[model samples]
Target: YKQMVQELEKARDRMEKLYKEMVELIQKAIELMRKIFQEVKQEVEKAIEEMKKLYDEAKKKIEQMIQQIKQGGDKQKMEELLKRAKEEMKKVKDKMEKLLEKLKQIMQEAKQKMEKLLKQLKEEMKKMKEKMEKLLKEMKQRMEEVKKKMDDELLEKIKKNIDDLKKIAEDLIKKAEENIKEAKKIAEQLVKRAKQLIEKAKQVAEELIKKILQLIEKAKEIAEKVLKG
Candidate 1:
């Protein structure tokens, strides 16, 4: 019976050692996961900040272009400026896409790791649930930051583009106004010339009529004198 008890004690100690090793491994895995999460989160945040800055700068450039257009400045020059701005914007978009891809890859890796850890934890009832909760909270916060940053940047860019278009339209309107004013001046001059010509024509017609009347009266007096003789 003593030998049987000793064997049972050895078995218990072995089980304890395995449990302690498993706990250490789980802690190490949790630490690795947290570190990866933090690294990815920081990278995503930095990327988002860069995108926001690019968007802000692009918006300002667009606004200035609009003002120039509204002032009826040179169209070709403004278009060249816009082309450069668009190129810069495209570059920023490419960078943003790259960053987003990286973020997705990292998040997917983290999620897979979490799922595996959770499965392992299910076999161990003594593990705390708070760790998973914390990871989920961090994920949610990062997601919110990503979403808000993208939305704000996109909206600002759209507004600035619209303003730039408005300036272009205003410039067109100013050009049209100048054309209309010049046309009006030419039309007024044509009307004045036509009025003077008509008056001169009427005066010549009246003089011709008076001469015909005087010749008719002279012929009538000559016929009367011939009849009397």
Candidate 2:
């Protein structure tokens, strides 16, 4: 079990590093979220960088334990180390999951707020469209009434001006439709990504925990055949 003891030591250090990195990433992500109100693009990139850093650490350590388990090791007295390792894995998992919950909360809040803003914008644009259409209709009617006795040249000039105004209003309605769709699409993506980042961090941490449990079982198998047998 000597090799197991050595691998266990490495496992312990790896988990330690993971917890430290996870906490750092969580804190940084939260800070970036707070400042996102002022500068969304910059803050999102920073938050993603933090998540990637933590995720890399988590995946690296899980790989270490998976390979380590296939090796040999036994120190009869080192038994308690396995117990402590399991608990440590559990400890870290709980913390990360808790942070995951918090991130989800933030995502929901952002989603609601952005959606409301978009709704408001859409409402305003619709009002502007309705008002512009009404104005165009009234102007067209006035031109018709005026032209009841006017010459064909003046009638054509008035008709051209009225048509130009109608075109402007139509263009605005189409542009509003495009802008509203684009804004909603971009905002939803951002909310979904933040939620995804936390989930990935939590997921990797859970994988690390699972691998740690597997290593403990492997240690037991070695103990059974070596000293116990």
The sequence of per-residue lDDT tens digits that candidate 1 reaches over residues 1-229 is: 2332343344334434444554565566556555655665565566556556655665565556444444533445545555554565566456556655665665566556556654554444233223333333443454455456654554444444434433443443344334334433443443344334334433443443344334333433433443345
Question: CA lDDT of 27 in candidate 2?
Answer: 44
lDDT of 2 by residue, 1-229 (tens): 2332343344334434433443344344434444544343344445445545544554455444434433535563345444554555565566556555655665666667666666666676666566666666666666667766444665666666667656655665676566667666666667766666656656665665576567667655654555554
TM-score of 1: 0.42
C-alpha lDDT of candidate 1 relative to the true structure: 0.47
Which has the greatest lDDT? 2
Distance from true position, residue 41, model 1, in Å? Answer: 1.6
The C-alpha TM-scores of every prediction are 0.42, 0.55
RMSD, candidate 1, Å = 39.3
CA RMSD per model (angstroms):
39.3, 23.9
Q: What's the true lDDT of residue 56 in model 2?
A: 52
| RMSD value for candidate 2 | 23.9
